Amino acid sequence: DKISHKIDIPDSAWTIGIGEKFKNAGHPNVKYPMIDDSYVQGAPLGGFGAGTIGRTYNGGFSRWHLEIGKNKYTTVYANQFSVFQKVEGNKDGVAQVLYAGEPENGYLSSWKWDYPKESGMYYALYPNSWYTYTNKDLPVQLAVKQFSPIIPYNYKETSYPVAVFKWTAYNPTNKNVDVSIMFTWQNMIGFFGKQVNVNSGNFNKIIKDKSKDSEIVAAVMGNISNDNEEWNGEYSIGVKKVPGVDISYKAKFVTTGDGSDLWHEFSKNGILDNKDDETPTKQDGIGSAIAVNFKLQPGQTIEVPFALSWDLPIMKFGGGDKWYKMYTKYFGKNGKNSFAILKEALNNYQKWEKMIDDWQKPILSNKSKPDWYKTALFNELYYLADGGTAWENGKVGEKRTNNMFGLLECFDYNYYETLDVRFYGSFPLVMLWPDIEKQVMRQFADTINVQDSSEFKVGSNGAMAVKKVQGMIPHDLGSSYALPWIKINAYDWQNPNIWKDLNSKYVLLVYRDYVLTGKTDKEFLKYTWKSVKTALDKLKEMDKDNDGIPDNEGIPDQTYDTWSMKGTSAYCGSLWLAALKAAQEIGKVLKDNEAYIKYNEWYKIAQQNFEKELWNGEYYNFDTESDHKDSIMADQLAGQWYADILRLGDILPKDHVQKALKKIYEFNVMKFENGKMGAVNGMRPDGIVDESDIQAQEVWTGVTYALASFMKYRGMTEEAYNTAYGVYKMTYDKSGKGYWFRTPEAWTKDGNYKASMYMRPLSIWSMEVNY
Ligand SMILES: OC[C@H]1O[C@H](O)[C@H](O)[C@@H](O)[C@@H]1O
Ligand SMILES: [Ca+2]
């Protein structure tokens, strides 16, 4: 490996061999189907709300999130980079697709598949990833750096449906070598959203944009229709000329054939025919190819940038609504702008690289933090783009001030912005994209007094319940299968209108968002204040025994939605205390004296009673009335965690919090698989895992990272990182279960998972305490 020195891959990048098999992979062990797309994954490409494309460590473009809210895992075999190399004065060269695999059927059988093992590496540090190619039959070594411009405090480039592939080629031998790199792409118009004749009308064109000291050559893959529909738009691939390289192309090859129309050209001398052909297809799949060819002398290096863009302006949800995607603000709405996007990328990618470096540097340059922690911190951010992210720039055929936003909780449970989950999962948004975070919370504010008296069947017990109750915060802002932002509470396993955490978590989120953006956004507090008061006031009415605390009802009436709580619970009770303290503080900021006084009185009564009811000398009991009420819950003091973040001080005595955290570390972590897998949710005082519900026996990745944050705030540094380490290990390490770029909600002690691609573990950003 002589190429790694010519490029700048951080030591904290996650790494795996190209073509590596992983032996220990976890699966769901479940009655009903659950997504399991395998361990062959990678860092995604594409901006927020743009639709994303998962290119795997084996090189395939395989995890398609282009249809907003859907996860479709299938390798589009025509989409590849390929290489040709010929040592000068040899009869023949060699051509190889850079993909560690082959097609299942006979399409593209002429191409050279099965990039060999032990011949290159994949590296990831989101939003960047890299491949190196160090192959005994390829004298010139190659690497590519690929990324999209995901940039904190930037709401423009961060939205773009674009990727850059910056190639480096180095000749370590003592012979001249002729080299070509070729990007192939299928015209994917009709891949989704088209009900009949999926390729019909697709056509490809070539754009050559020449100007002083500049040339871009691109293929634009579109359709002859000017229909404004979800399925229609354009893909583009292209390259920018650099000194010493020539460009060749082929406008049209048939993807539903053997591929030799393209491959006989590339494999001969790495130079394509430069044949333009705009003839539209009918049934056959078609694709385009862009290539560069160059001669490398001994010791010579060259760099050449390619790019990919996709202008699919309209997202459609299953309930029928059609919306424009955010990037359309910058490029237009007509779906004929893929070349403009691609050109912006090829003319600005060096600046984008620097902007990414600028935001990663503070963490990377902190040598007190272990590299493993940095691996998880950056790579967990994949989900912000990959989580079905919807970011609208108008309803099709209709203009407001704001752009509504939603991130899915996951794909198995297809709900936008699940509030009980975003309490944990929204840290990257508040810390890095706060204008989005505030928009999401105003969306929740707007829902507080919505009433929907229509009834739905509750999944857990089969009873009927009212959809949305006035004054209760919704569980979620709808589903991609229905009407995001319009029809809320898509979730139906339990009735969220009687949840005891959502209203308090909402208040805590509001105050968090004020505190973590500088304590200056009075307008945001003013916008949300009425909803904050309503939320706490409604929750107060759920106090059935007048101890000043809402009562859990002997059912799963909170985020642990199969784990029953009864009476006063540590979890909902601490959250309530913290939420009252936040509301007092907002009252003071807004000069609402009556509110300050009311919530101060409620707080003092509830705090006193919480302590008496639950403090047992070592930790806080799970609750007052359940069968295993003395279980040690990992999340028992979630309220005090948020209070630390919000700078609200002690809601419980310092000494008692410290003892509780130490007990959680000693038991839920260190007595669960030797502390190598995170914090199990429920442990019995005898040191045996609580078996009363599956959730008690699960580690929740996002709960565990949040707990690590709490420990870190409380000066338990070693316990904090050891607790987080088991999550990193399980996700990323060779000894783990192969969950990279699909971090799940949960695993059990055998390592098998629930709900891959989950929002909650974004909570790792709560560990950026100093920030
Ligand atoms: O795994 C538990 C979780 O399952 C689903 O994501 C529910 O929508 C969520 O509310 C709950 O916390
Ligand atoms: Ca009560």
* Best CA proximity match to 459, nearest among 310, 562, 320: 562
Q: In this structure, which ligand is nearest to the CA of 418?
A: 1
Q: Please state whether the peptide bond connecting residue 127 to the residue before it is cis, i.e. omega within 30 degrees of 0.
A: yes
d(CA 424, CA 766): 8
User: Which residue type occupies 58?
Assistant: N
* Best CA proximity match to 406, nearest among 378, 442, 379: 442
Tell which one of 489, 681, 745 to mutate to probe ligand 1, the residue whose CB is within 8 A of the most ligand atoms: 745
d(CA 46, CA 419): 25
497 alpha carbon, distance to own chain's centre: 28
Tell which one of 35, 414, 418, 635 to mutate to probe ligand 1, the residue whose CB is within 8 A of the most ligand atoms: 418
Extents of the domains making up the chain: 1-364, 365-771
* Best CA proximity match to 34, nearest among 741, 746, 760: 746
The answer to whether 9 touches 130, Cβ cutoff 8 Å, is: yes
The answer to whether 298 touches 176, Cβ cutoff 8 Å, is: yes
Measure the CA angle with vertex 164, ends 162 and 166; round to 5°: 175
The answer to whether 743 touches 758, Cβ cutoff 8 Å, is: yes
The answer to whether 271 touches 312, Cβ cutoff 8 Å, is: no
Ligand 1 atom at minimal distance to the Cα of residue 746: 1
At residue 315, the 3 state secondary structure works out as strand
The neighbour count for residue 319, using CB atoms within 10 Å, is 15
Phi, psi of 263, rounded to the nearest 5 degrees: -65, -35
d(CA 262, CA 266): 7
Ligand 1 atom at minimal distance to the Cα of residue 562: 2
d(CA 466, CA 495): 8
At residue 124, the 3 state secondary structure works out as strand
Residue 424 CB–ligand 1 contact under 6 Å: no
User: Which residue type occupies 751?
Assistant: G
d(CA 49, CA 406): 9
d(CA 711, CA 668): 14
CA distances from 413 to 71, 201, 678, 745 (A): 12, 36, 23, 11
d(CA 302, CA 142): 10
3-state SS string over 522-569? HHHHHHHHHHHHHHHHHHHCCCCCCCCCCCEEEECCCCCCCCCEEECE
Q: Which residues sit directly before a break in the chain (C to N > 2.5 Å)? A: 398
Q: In this structure, which ligand is nearest to the CA of 563?
A: 1
CA distances from 459 to 47, 467, 483, 496, 561 (A): 35, 13, 20, 12, 11
Q: How many residues does the chain have?
A: 771
Side-chain-side CA neighbours of residue 414 (13 Å): 18
Q: In this structure, which ligand is nearest to the CA of 543?
A: 2
User: Which residue type occupies 410?
Assistant: C
Distance 695 CA to ligand 1 centre (A): 10
Distance 197 CA to ligand 2 centre (A): 61
The residue assigned the tokens 């790579």 is 379
Assigned token pair, 392: 């609208």
Distance 231 CA to ligand 2 centre (A): 53
User: Which residue type occupies 347?
Assistant: N
Residue 418 CB–ligand 1 contact under 6 Å: yes
Ligand 1 atom at minimal distance to the Cα of residue 409: 6
The neighbour count for residue 558, using CB atoms within 10 Å, is 24
Distance 763 CA to ligand 1 centre (A): 15
Q: 591-608 as b/e, with b when 16 or more CB fall inside 10 Å? A: ebeebbebbbebbebbbe
* Best CA proximity match to 308, nearest among 221, 416, 434: 221
Cross-strand bridge partners of residue 245: 294
In terms of Cβ atoms closer than 10 Å to its own Cβ (0-12, 13-18, 19+), residue 761 is buried
Supply the Cα-derived Rg of the chain in whole angstroms.
27
d(CA 141, CA 61): 22
d(CA 205, CA 350): 27
What lies within 8 Å, CB to CB, of 540 at 6+ separation is 550, 602
Q: Is the dihedral of CA 347, 351, 355, 356 positive or negative?
A: positive
The answer to whether 327 touches 47, Cβ cutoff 8 Å, is: yes
The answer to whether 23 touches 128, Cβ cutoff 8 Å, is: no
Q: In this structure, which ligand is nearest to the CA of 702?
A: 1
Assigned token pair, 614: 């639950």
Residue 421 CB–ligand 1 contact under 6 Å: yes
User: Which residue type occupies 643?
Assistant: A
DSSP-derived secondary structure letter, 770:
-
Tell which one of 413, 424, 477 to mutate to probe ligand 1, the residue whose CB is within 8 A of the most ligand atoms: 413
* Best CA proximity match to 67, nearest among 308, 404, 322: 322
Distance 305 CA to ligand 1 centre (A): 42
Q: Please state whether the peptide bond connecting residue 161 to the residue before it is cis, i.e. omega within 30 degrees of 0.
A: no
* Best CA proximity match to 433, nearest among 531, 529, 359: 359
Residue 698 CB–ligand 1 contact under 6 Å: no
Assigned token pair, 198: 């999926």
Cross-strand bridge partners of residue 632: 683
The answer to whether 38 touches 125, Cβ cutoff 8 Å, is: no
The answer to whether 737 touches 25, Cβ cutoff 8 Å, is: yes
What lies within 8 Å, CB to CB, of 247 at 6+ separation is 215, 217, 239, 241, 290, 291, 292
DSSP-derived secondary structure letter, 675:
G
Residue 559 CB–ligand 1 contact under 6 Å: yes
d(CA 235, CA 383): 23
The answer to whether 652 touches 611, Cβ cutoff 8 Å, is: yes
Q: In this structure, which ligand is nearest to the CA of 572?
A: 2
Distance 6 CA to ligand 1 centre (A): 46
Give the annotated binding-site residues: 543, 545, 547, 549, 551
d(CA 363, CA 374): 7
d(CA 166, CA 176): 23
d(CA 92, CA 87): 8
d(CA 67, CA 73): 12
d(CA 310, CA 641): 42
Ligand 1 atom at minimal distance to the Cα of residue 496: 10
CA distances from 464 to 44, 478, 557, 559 (A): 41, 19, 16, 20
Distance 548 CA to ligand 2 centre (A): 6
Residue 491 CB–ligand 1 contact under 6 Å: yes
The answer to whether 420 touches 505, Cβ cutoff 8 Å, is: yes
Tell which one of 422, 477, 561, 699 to mutate to probe ligand 1, the residue whose CB is within 8 A of the most ligand atoms: 561
d(CA 169, CA 144): 9
The answer to whether 389 touches 406, Cβ cutoff 8 Å, is: yes
- Helices 593-614, 522-540: axis angle to 10 degrees equals 50
Residue 690 CB–ligand 1 contact under 6 Å: no
Relative to beta strand 245-254, strand 234-240 is unpaired
Distance 421 CA to ligand 1 centre (A): 7
Question: In which region does residue 757 sit, left (phi positive, over 0), alpha (psi from -120 to 50) or beta (all else)?
Answer: left
The residue assigned the tokens 């302590």 is 611
Give the annotated binding-site residues for Ca(2+): 543, 545, 547, 549, 551
Dihedral Cα 222, 226, 232, 236, nearest 10 deg:
30
The residue assigned the tokens 């959680």 is 664
Cross-strand bridge partners of residue 419: none
At residue 206, the 3 state secondary structure works out as strand
d(CA 341, CA 326): 13
d(CA 211, CA 217): 12
In terms of Cβ atoms closer than 10 Å to its own Cβ (0-12, 13-18, 19+), residue 463 is exposed
Residue 701 CB–ligand 1 contact under 6 Å: no
The protein residue whose alpha carbon is closest to atom 5 in ligand 1 is 413
3-state SS string over 443-465? HHHHHCCCCEEEEEECCCCCCEE
d(CA 695, CA 628): 14
The neighbour count for residue 659, using CB atoms within 10 Å, is 17
Distance 578 CA to ligand 2 centre (A): 16
Phi, psi of 351, rounded to the nearest 5 degrees: -65, -40
Query: What's the resolution in A?
Result: 1.8
* Best CA proximity match to 568, nearest among 601, 608, 596, 604: 608
Residue 747 CB–ligand 1 contact under 6 Å: no
Residue 473 CB–ligand 1 contact under 6 Å: no
The protein residue whose alpha carbon is closest to atom 4 in ligand 1 is 561
User: Which residue type occupies 300?
Assistant: Q
Distance 533 CA to ligand 2 centre (A): 19
Relative to beta strand 177-186, strand 234-240 is unpaired
Q: 466-490 as b/e, with b when 16 or more CB fall inside 10 Å? A: bbbbebbbbbbbbbbebbbbebbbb
At residue 380, the 3 state secondary structure works out as helix
The protein residue whose alpha carbon is closest to atom 12 in ligand 1 is 559
Q: In what side-by-side order are the strands of the sheet with 286-296?
A: 94-97, 80-87, 177-186, 286-296, 245-254
Number of H helices, E strands in the chain: 16, 31
d(CA 104, CA 88): 35
Residue 412 CB–ligand 1 contact under 6 Å: no
DSSP-derived secondary structure letter, 621:
-
3-state SS string over 219-287? EEEEECCCCCCCCCCEEEEEEECCCCEEEEEEEEEECCCCCHHHHHHHHHHCCCCCECCCCCCCCCCEE
580 alpha carbon, distance to own chain's centre: 32
607 alpha carbon, distance to own chain's centre: 37
The answer to whether 558 touches 539, Cβ cutoff 8 Å, is: no
In terms of Cβ atoms closer than 10 Å to its own Cβ (0-12, 13-18, 19+), residue 336 is middle
Please state how this structure was obtained.
X-ray
The answer to whether 55 touches 62, Cβ cutoff 8 Å, is: yes
DSSP-derived secondary structure letter, 493:
S
